[PDB]
Design a protein around this ligand. Structure first.
Ligand SMILES: *[C@@H]1O[C@H](CO)[C@@H](O)[C@H](O)[C@H]1NC(C)=O
Ligand SMILES: [Cu+2]
Length: 357
């Protein structure tokens, strides 16, 4: 019942600004995704390295670089690096939480910023309202007005290709070329039946009045003709419609089937288009007020088990949780000594009785 202000990218190079513009930009270089370029003190910058990837399939993301106040976060498909130091997840530090699920790597900042990446095509940034009118990059100016509704002095308009190219971050001594102006961009108009059939299904009943349907249709027509092999692209776009509903306070239903884009989780994890934002985990770090936010898609543990974010052994009973200290894993039962307390790993927590010093 309470939404967020999100900019996102997914699938075959689709982008969505804070203000709701959806465009395609197929650049393969490093870009300014979103920045506090108007702050008197710059509070954040998010850079998106696309890298090379496979055509006629959703586009890859090589890495993400986050700067927030005095902290630097570098994310890849396998790495999480904090101020140059490789870190284990979950990682908690002052007003910054990095955590890794099977569905998403997520970054949470007390500076007014949350970031979620599925470690493939789909990336998404929620910002606090205090950053209205403050932002640069592919995500727009966050000012409450759309491309179609606007133009600048001297009749300056930016096509999606040159707006994207303007955000390129050049690396000394590395060559990376913009994409070439696309020859005859055919506006695939003959698949609208199937696409609208999909974004109107009973599963998006709640979403029809929360998320504007027209931008996602045209992106869905684009998918059906630029990605003619299979359904990989057009299901990124239906997933994104689902995601936009959830981030706007709504509850999409389960729209996937055995033939209509199956999605399964490892082990005994359950895929839900909309589950709790807060599950118990072996680390027990998910206790902040983020538990009061809207529901989201992902992989969830069956009742009676907790997600083992410490020893990566799936959904376990809490009594079988690993503990962690100074980079080392511990089994339930093992005991450790610091000073005047000896601590035992119990149910994923370090329970400590005091001793004489
Ligand atoms: C942001 O900018 C728009 C257009 O310039 C303006 O209408 C709006 O009041 C601004 N928001 C603020 C100052 O919070
Ligand atoms: Cu949200």
């Amino acid at each position: 019942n309470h939404g967020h202000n999100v900019c996102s990218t997914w699938g075959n190079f689709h982008y969505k600004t804070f203000d709701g513009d959806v465009f395609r930009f197929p650049g393969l270089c490093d870009y300014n995704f979103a920045s506090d370029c108007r702050g008197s003190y710059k509070e954040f910058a998010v850079h998106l390295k696309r890298g090379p990837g496979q055509a006629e399939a959703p586009a890859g993301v090589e890495s993400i670089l986050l700067t927030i106040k005095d902290d630097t976060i570098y994310l890849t498909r396998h790495l999480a690096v904090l101020n140059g130091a490789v870190v284990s997840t979950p990682h908690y530090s002052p007003g910054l939480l990095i955590e890794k699920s099977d569905a998403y790597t997520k970054v949470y900042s007390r500076a007014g910023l949350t970031l979620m990446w599925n470690r493939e095509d789909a990336l998404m940034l929620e910002l606090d309202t205090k950053f209205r009118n403050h932002t640069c990059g592919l995500c727009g100016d966050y000012n409450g007005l759309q491309s179609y509704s606007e133009f600048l002095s001297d009749g300056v308009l930016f096509s999606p290709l040159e707006f994207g190219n303007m955000q390129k971050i050049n690396q000394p001594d590395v060559v990376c070329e913009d994409p070439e102006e696309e020859v005859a961009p055919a506006s695939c108009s003959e698949h609208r039946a199937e696409c609208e059939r999909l974004l109107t299904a009973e599963a998006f009943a709640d979403c029809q009045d929360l998320v504007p349907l027209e931008p996602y249709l045209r992106a869905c027509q684009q998918d059906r003709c630029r990605c003619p092999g299979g359904d990989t692209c057009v299901c990124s776009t239906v997933a994104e419609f689902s995601r936009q509903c959830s981030h706007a306070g709504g509850r999409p239903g389960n729209w996937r089937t055995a033939t209509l884009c199956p999605k399964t989780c490892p082990g005994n994890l359950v895929y839900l288009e909309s589950g709790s934002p807060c599950m118990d985990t072996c680390s027990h770090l998910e206790v902040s007020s983020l538990c009061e936010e809207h529901r989201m898609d992902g992989c969830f543990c069956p009742e009676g088990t907790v997600y083992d974010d410490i020893g990566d052994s799936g959904c376990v009973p809490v009594s079988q949780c690993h503990c962690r200290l100074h980079g080392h894993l511990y089994t339930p039962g093992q005991e450790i000594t610091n000073d005047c307390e000896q601590c035992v790993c119990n149910a994923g927590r370090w329970v400590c009785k005091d001793l004489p010093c």
